[PDB]
């Protein structure tokens, strides 16, 4: 009937409806759960060769226009019927159908609200929508991609927007954003043998490069964005600094800590996911939110796979760096995520601790159970990278389902590309 | 054919075999991840009325000595049928069967082999079993559990051991431990609307007090045996203080922490577990590692439900206690790590920081993948509840399944009990 749902601390049940509206299939088989896994194939949504089939189409379309119109307080069911003919009309005459900016905003912030990786959600209903649908060349993305980082960025006071460009149409004519997001920092391999940078940036920086791209071999040398429009290859560009805003790292305390020379943008916006709302599928709508102080502190800098900086922060606080049992590591980390948070604040650029984000999560969650019985969670994503069950969110048990609307991943786009 | 799993840190991949050998059905449905629930029924193993039919119990039987006989360097093949031969006459002619010495050590180890919530695993070649499968009464299971905690114990230098009593037969003649834990303390709701001691053993606690137990009123009062032998009514026995050996909190900096008056139990003994093991189950084999500092210091001494002292000890660190972005909870519960590792270091106690402990089961991964093609695992569980990401852990894919043999949750015994 429904899953019962228990939060062992506060000692709260939840029952789960929602549950029943999922997707086909999600992550996890019968005998084996793969809710560990990061890149599942039941949350990517990959290539095609031809339209979506009719049969498949319609449905879904139908699904979603009911699901908008019966949003509204008051129902405009003459419209409602209106817009079910309007859209069947549409996808028999055409193939496929354009979504109404109104449904297009309200596809978009119910994707983010089923996001069960998302710890920011309870934002929600405060989403600008950039409507891109019209972009036909790389030069004209790029120009969208400008305005979103501008707007969104609003001088440190963040805004969360997002910024759908053209649906695919056969598949074979997708727009595609080949960077990981907006604004992200290039790795290099030195000829020291040590690599300089983001290591996770490491094979697109190359792919960069072999698109002609400037390495200017630093720390922290923003990527430029590789754009590619109605099918045709990939075309480099490089992103204007004066839209690049970042935020030099300061302890408030250790003074020795700018010594360190780090730095991070101000703006975390997703740039490879796919939209997926009533049988439709936008490969290119980059979006942003604001940062969680733990993304950069715990895992862009002291992921060993990324910036790698706890070993020197242990040893500049003067911790026993050679022996794990002192806690050295838990010390430093901590102070970085302070650094973070108070380097953001005073320079007035947007961003929320993890605690205050996780208490929110939950604030929302509470209002999704109780406004439409239930609400996806990916407790593996939502629970913050340090201070577990300090949080609130560690100890509520949750339902990991995959919704409609829905963002998925796609397929890394160098492995599934055309070279005229 | 298996499933690809990677290591987000190292990079390095692993193919799991393993998943194949699975249990019937795990905790998720085919359009929902159920990981997060922390007593499901894929979990559990409940009560019985009637033995358990002939035609279950012997493949199962027949699988676990093929896996018991194919585990030698050099098998030995006659006595590998002669068992085989032995077994299926005596489950024919009894209806159950009796497992050997050496089986059911193989058992134990295999169980905890697959527990895939136990981060410390790579210590399962060493467990000291106690056959106490001819025990008929409850003070003789009293008398059992002393030996086990006076054992394992080993006057801090713990000793991993299991003790296992007489196998379900009819499952009305059920051996079981009321208990959640060997050593435990007890938590009442005082008359000041406070609640003193571990606010978990609440309901327990009532449950003693029903049965005649006399409330010492405390913070740290160990709570008695609650024993129930061959399915009568369970017979309550104080633990002899001379066993429970504590370790009293205190910081190596911080010397007003000792004037928080805390101390904890050094034996983590599990209870109320039951091992399955070739179709054979065992409701009573209680059975200890060593602590893991978290456990205590984060979530027995800083859970909302449990002690709950973060606050305060937030507070007798001077730091803002009211301004959740301080990160001040981050700062007092590190502190609480590290007193909790350090006393038990003081008084000679083991015990193994989150960090080694990690690293060691990481270690234990790659044997198990070598040795047998895989590792079931839940990431949810093998995560500290501090210091997430800072862990290998963190980053390394899962495979969470139930193989066999393995140790099963019950249902609570009052809820599921005869009185007369
Ligand atoms: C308003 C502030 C927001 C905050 C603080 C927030 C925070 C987060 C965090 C902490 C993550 C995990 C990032 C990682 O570990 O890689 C995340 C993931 C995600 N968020 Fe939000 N978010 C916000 C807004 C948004 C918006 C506006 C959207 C979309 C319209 C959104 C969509 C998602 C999605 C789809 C993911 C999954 C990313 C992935 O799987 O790689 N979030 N968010
Ligand atoms: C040698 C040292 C050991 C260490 C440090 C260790 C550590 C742990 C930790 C941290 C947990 C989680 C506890 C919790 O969060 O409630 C756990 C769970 C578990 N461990 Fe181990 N363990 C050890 C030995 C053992 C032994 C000897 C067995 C069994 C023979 C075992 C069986 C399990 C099981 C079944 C669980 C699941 C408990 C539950 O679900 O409530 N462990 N262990
Ligand atoms: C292997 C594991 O799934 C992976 O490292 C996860 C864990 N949780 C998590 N959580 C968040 N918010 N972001 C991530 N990148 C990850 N990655
Ligand atoms: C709700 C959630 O499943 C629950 O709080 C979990 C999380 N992980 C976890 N991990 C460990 N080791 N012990 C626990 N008690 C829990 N409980
Ligand atoms: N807050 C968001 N989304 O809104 N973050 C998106 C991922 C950013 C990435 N985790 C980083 O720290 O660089
Ligand atoms: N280390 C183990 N098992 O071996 N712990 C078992 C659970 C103990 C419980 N988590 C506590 O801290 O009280
Ligand atoms: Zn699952």
Same mark, same amino acid.
């Given at each position: 009937?429904?899953?019962?749902?228990?939060?062992?601390?506060?000692?709260?049940?939840?029952?789960?409806?929602?549950?029943?509206?999922?997707?086909?299939?999600?992550?996890?088989?019968?005998?084996?759960?793969?809710?560990?896994?990061?890149?599942?194939?039941?949350?990517?949504?990959?290539?095609?060769?031809?339209?979506?089939?009719?049969?498949?189409?319609?449905?879904?379309?139908?699904?979603?226009?009911?699901?908008?119109?019966?949003?509204?307080?008051?129902?405009?069911?003459?419209?409602?019927?209106?817009?079910?003919?309007?859209?069947?009309?549409?996808?028999?005459?055409?193939?496929?159908?354009?979504?109404?900016?109104?449904?297009?905003?309200?596809?978009?912030?119910?994707?983010?609200?089923?996001?069960?990786?998302?710890?920011?959600?309870?934002?929600?209903?405060?989403?600008?929508?950039?409507?891109?649908?019209?972009?036909?060349?790389?030069?004209?993305?790029?120009?969208?991609?400008?305005?979103?980082?501008?707007?969104?960025?609003?001088?440190?006071?963040?805004?969360?927007?997002?910024?759908?460009?053209?649906?695919?149409?056969?598949?074979?004519?997708?727009?595609?954003?080949?960077?990981?997001?907006?604004?992200?920092?290039?790795?290099?391999?030195?000829?020291?043998?040590?690599?300089?940078?983001?290591?996770?940036?490491?094979?697109?920086?190359?792919?960069?490069?072999?698109?002609?791209?400037?390495?200017?071999?630093?720390?922290?040398?923003?990527?430029?964005?590789?754009?590619?429009?109605?099918? #045709?290859?990939?075309? =480099?560009?490089?992103?204007?600094?004066?839209?690049?805003? %970042?935020?030099? @790292?300061? !302890?408030?305390?250790? +003074?020795?800590?700018?010594?360190?020379?780090?730095?991070?943008?101000?703006?975390?916006?997703?740039?490879?996911?796919?939209?997926?709302?009533?049988?439709?599928?936008?490969?290119?709508?980059?979006?942003?939110?604001?940062?969680?102080?733990?993304?950069?502190?715990?895992?862009?800098?002291?992921?060993?796979?990324?910036?790698?900086?706890?070993?020197?922060?242990?040893?500049?606080?003067?911790?026993?760096?050679?022996?794990?049992?002192?806690?050295?590591?838990?010390?430093?980390?901590?102070?970085?995520?302070?650094?973070?948070?108070?380097?953001? #604040?005073?320079?007035? =650029?947007?961003?929320?601790?993890?605690?205050?984000?996780? %208490?929110?999560? @939950?604030? !929302?969650?509470?209002? +999704?159970?109780?406004?439409?019985?239930?609400?996806?969670?990916?407790?593996?994503?939502?629970?913050?990278?340090?201070?577990?069950?300090?949080?609130?969110?560690?100890?509520?048990?949750?339902?990991?389902?995959?919704?409609?609307?829905?963002?998925?991943?796609?397929?890394?786009?160098?492995?599934?590309?055309?070279?005229?």
């Amino acid at each position: 009937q429904y899953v019962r749902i228990k939060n062992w601390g506060s000692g709260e049940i939840l029952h789960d409806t929602l549950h029943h509206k999922a997707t086909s299939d999600f992550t996890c088989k019968s005998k084996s759960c793969l809710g560990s896994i990061m890149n599942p194939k039941s949350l990517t949504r990959g290539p095609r060769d031809k339209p979506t089939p009719l049969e498949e189409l319609l449905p879904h379309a139908i699904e979603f226009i009911n699901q908008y119109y019966g949003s509204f307080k008051e129902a405009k069911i003459e419209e409602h019927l209106a817009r079910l003919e309007a859209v069947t009309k549409e996808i028999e005459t055409t193939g496929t159908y354009q979504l109404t900016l109104d449904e297009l905003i309200f596809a978009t912030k119910m994707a983010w609200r089923n996001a069960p990786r998302c710890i920011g959600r309870i934002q929600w209903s405060n989403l600008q929508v950039f409507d891109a649908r019209n972009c036909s060349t790389a030069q004209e993305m790029f120009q969208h991609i400008c305005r979103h980082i501008l707007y969104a960025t609003n001088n440190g006071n963040i805004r969360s927007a997002i910024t759908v460009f053209p649906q695919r149409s056969d598949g074979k004519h997708d727009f595609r954003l080949w960077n990981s997001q907006l604004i992200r920092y290039a790795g290099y391999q030195m000829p020291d043998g040590t690599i300089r940078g983001d290591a996770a940036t490491l094979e697109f920086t190359q792919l960069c490069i072999d698109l002609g791209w400037k390495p200017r071999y630093g720390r922290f040398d923003v990527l430029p964005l590789v754009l590619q429009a109605d099918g #045709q290859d990939p075309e =480099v560009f490089e992103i204007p600094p004066d839209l690049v805003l %970042e935020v030099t @790292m300061e !302890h408030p305390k250790y +003074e020795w800590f700018q010594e360190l020379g780090l730095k991070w943008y101000a703006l975390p916006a997703v740039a490879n996911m796919l939209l997926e709302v009533g049988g439709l599928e936008f490969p290119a709508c980059p979006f942003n939110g604001w940062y969680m102080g733990t993304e950069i502190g715990v895992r862009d800098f002291c992921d060993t796979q990324r910036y790698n900086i706890l070993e020197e922060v242990g040893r500049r606080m003067g911790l026993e760096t050679h022996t794990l049992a002192s806690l050295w590591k838990d010390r430093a980390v901590t102070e970085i995520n302070v650094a973070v948070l108070h380097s953001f #604040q005073k320079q007035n =650029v947007t961003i929320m601790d993890h605690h205050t984000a996780s %208490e929110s999560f @939950m604030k !929302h969650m509470q209002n +999704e159970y109780r406004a439409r019985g239930g609400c996806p969670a990916d407790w593996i994503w939502l629970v913050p990278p340090v201070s577990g069950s300090i949080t609130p969110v560690f100890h509520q048990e949750m339902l990991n389902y995959v919704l409609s609307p829905f963002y998925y991943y796609q397929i890394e786009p160098w492995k599934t590309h055309i070279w005229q």
